[PDB]
């Protein structure tokens, strides 16, 4: 779940 | 932010007013100029919907109408007999 | 979408990682 927390962070960047 | 995050004024963890705020951000940045009316008419919208949600907060958590007649009864002395028995006893040993 | 509505930038992603830590810190102590 290493890049998975960063993948949800980039997914939250496109939804912010 | 101190006590609990679902208790926010705007609606930030709990509501969706901040996406309306995001829409406000979209409206207010592409404008190359500046005036007074366009800036301040949407200073309502970041205030007024925020100024009502905390009013709908503290009614239910506290029974607002309870302590805000109680604190006036301690200071303006609404329970008039209930302090005179204190005054009668406190006179005899404040001598 | 747009950078200037995403503002800004790295403490918001870090405050996303702390519930990502949190969803394991909250679920471990239930098992303890």
TrEMBL record, chain B:
<comment type="subunit">
    <text>Component of the gamma-tubulin ring complex (gTuRC) consisting of TUBGCP2, TUBGCP3, TUBGCP4, TUBGCP5 and TUBGCP6 and gamma-tubulin TUBG1 or TUBG2. TUBGCP2, TUBGCP3, TUBGCP4, TUBGCP5 and TUBGCP6 assemble in a 5:5:2:1:1 stoichiometry; each is associated with a gamma-tubulin, thereby arranging 14 gamma-tubulins in a helical manner. Gamma-tubulin at the first position is blocked by TUBGCP3 at the last position, allowing 13 protafilaments to grow into a microtubule.</text>
</comment>
<protein>
    <recommendedName>
        <fullName>Gamma-tubulin complex component</fullName>
    </recommendedName>
</protein>
<comment type="similarity">
    <text>Belongs to the TUBGCP family.</text>
</comment>
<comment type="function">
    <text>Component of the gamma-tubulin ring complex (gTuRC) which mediates microtubule nucleation. The gTuRC regulates the minus-end nucleation of alpha-beta tubulin heterodimers that grow into microtubule protafilaments, a critical step in centrosome duplication and spindle formation.</text>
</comment>
TrEMBL record, chain C:
<comment type="similarity">
    <text>Belongs to the TUBGCP family.</text>
</comment>
<comment type="function">
    <text>Component of the gamma-tubulin ring complex (gTuRC) which mediates microtubule nucleation. The gTuRC regulates the minus-end nucleation of alpha-beta tubulin heterodimers that grow into microtubule protafilaments, a critical step in centrosome duplication and spindle formation.</text>
</comment>
<comment type="subunit">
    <text>Component of the gamma-tubulin ring complex (gTuRC) consisting of TUBGCP2, TUBGCP3, TUBGCP4, TUBGCP5 and TUBGCP6 and gamma-tubulin TUBG1 or TUBG2. TUBGCP2, TUBGCP3, TUBGCP4, TUBGCP5 and TUBGCP6 assemble in a 5:5:2:1:1 stoichiometry; each is associated with a gamma-tubulin, thereby arranging 14 gamma-tubulins in a helical manner. Gamma-tubulin at the first position is blocked by TUBGCP3 at the last position, allowing 13 protafilaments to grow into a microtubule.</text>
</comment>
<protein>
    <recommendedName>
        <fullName>Gamma-tubulin complex component</fullName>
    </recommendedName>
</protein>
């Amino acid at each position: 779940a290493a890049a998975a927390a960063a993948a949800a962070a980039a997914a939250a960047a496109a939804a912010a | 932010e101190n006590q609990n995050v679902n208790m926010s004024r705007t609606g930030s963890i709990l509501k969706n007013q901040e996406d309306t705020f995001a829409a406000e951000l979209h409206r207010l940045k592409q404008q190359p100029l500046f005036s007074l009316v366009d800036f301040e008419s949407v200073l309502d919208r970041i205030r007024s919907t925020v100024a009502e949600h905390l009013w709908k907060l503290m009614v239910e958590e506290s029974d607002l109408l309870g302590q805000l007649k109680i604190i006036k009864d301690f200071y303006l002395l609404g329970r008039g007999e209930l302090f005179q028995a204190f005054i009668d006893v406190a006179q005899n040993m404040l001598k | 979408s747009e950078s200037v509505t995403c503002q800004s930038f790295e403490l918001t992603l870090r405050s996303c990682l702390y519930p990502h830590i949190g969803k394991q810190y909250l679920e471990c102590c239930g098992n303890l």
